[PDB]
Symmetry: D2
């Protein structure tokens, strides 16, 4: 099994406050499950080769997704911003597979990624434990 445990940091009240509105798990590698403990979020997966997505909405209406997973035994991540209401995590998660338009990002096996949305919100995913089967990352909104 692989697990990825996420801690969500929110830095700047001027951007609003984000909460989870959707959590998906892709079906490869015997799937997996999201759980919550002590304010953190863990994605537990049946092996290497799958992922999950958290979609967040701010109290100012902004929609963004955070994807994390393991590809060929190495962690990966992505953040997609500027989403329309119909672009749910259910739409987004599969786009990393089956030659979809986000596969290239999974293939990078990134330990960190940064993006600013068009409306000016900074997002970062930074793995703090980057190797092995019990991975850890901070997700930072600013």
């Amino acid at each position: 099994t692989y697990s990825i445990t996420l801690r969500v940091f929110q830095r700047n009240p001027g951007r609003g406050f984000f909460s989870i509105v959707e959590k998906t798990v892709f079906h490869y590698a015997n799937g997996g499950t999201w759980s919550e403990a002590k304010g953190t979020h863990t994605l537990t997966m049946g092996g290497s080769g799958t992922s999950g997505v958290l979609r967040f909405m701010s109290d100012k209406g902004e929609l963004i997704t955070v994807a994390v997973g393991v590809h060929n035994y190495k962690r990966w991540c992505d953040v997609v911003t500027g989403l329309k209401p119909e672009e749910t995590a259910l739409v987004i998660n599969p786009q990393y597979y089956n030659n979809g338009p986000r596969a290239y990002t999974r293939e990078k096996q990134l330990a960190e990624y940064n993006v600013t949305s068009v409306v000016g919100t900074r997002f970062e995913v930074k793995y703090t434990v980057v190797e092995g089967n019990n991975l850890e990352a901070n997700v930072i909104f600013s």
Copy 2:
């Protein structure tokens, strides 16, 4: 908009205790979002014609999904039991659409549904507010 607010009742400790492991929203009708308040769960959707799925796992390992949505201005529900780890909510939710194998169940526009899993767990979804745009249902595990 349509909303469906769910209250989860668990009746029988002998079946174990269930918690949410995934929440999806289908992309029709401008999508929608899950939220939590006072121990309840609300799916807020952009109009009639979409749905969302909660997947639950018990502390005894059982996996089941609960689907709720609105089809042609009437509520619907379903429960799928006996799921394998790879049959995530991300797999299940789309199966109600595009002539998928669960579409017939959405088309029934049920205000209640009952099923017992092969391992003996009873599940019921029962709408308590069955008309209008602010729907309410109890989800009962036993």
Copy 3:
């Protein structure tokens, strides 16, 4: 240290639906902390001789407290029903100590307790692991 992990089973929609409105920890035995994981609640305490209280409110306005702790190396529990709004958990938890009016109930060291309230709600606390330092109980509203 001692821990008590609680699973809350709400059986009967006719009583309405309860959510937590307060959680206290008494200061003996070097105190302790409440945490949440996978829909459960754990009180971790620094030794034998302290306790914590969860207060619940139903969406029909009913207020009740559940107390759990360890007294002379044995678990105890209590449920107080029919509470007024001014009777917060902060009021109730100390009443088990300093020769307060609920001390006798702590002293019973009960592994199960059943009480039905003035509005008809049935409450049960039943420990499923009743000995040792890693205690487990079901809290059932019916």
Copy 4:
């Protein structure tokens, strides 16, 4: 009635990550209740003259309390850091009343407060809606 709604912003992973371990409500003004919605925390109180406390613990072991309430129709707040395990919120909340050692801080009726702890964690409470019965504040750990 008065309500205070809190949004918790954790800015700095270097301080570790905090989660709630206790929530108390003082018994004046007919008491009150904590609730959670969309990742936020609301204390609802029966009138002016009471308060509640959230205690937080970081995954590095740090214990701190945030107190919020209404005194003579004006909001107040306080943050206490460097707490010992025996100094539970149940100990701290009453210290603002009955001529206790923190009463002066309540009496200040602060709309903002900044304190940095012995281990270097910066805390700020800042009310964003500072008048009326529907109060709002950001709680920032940095």
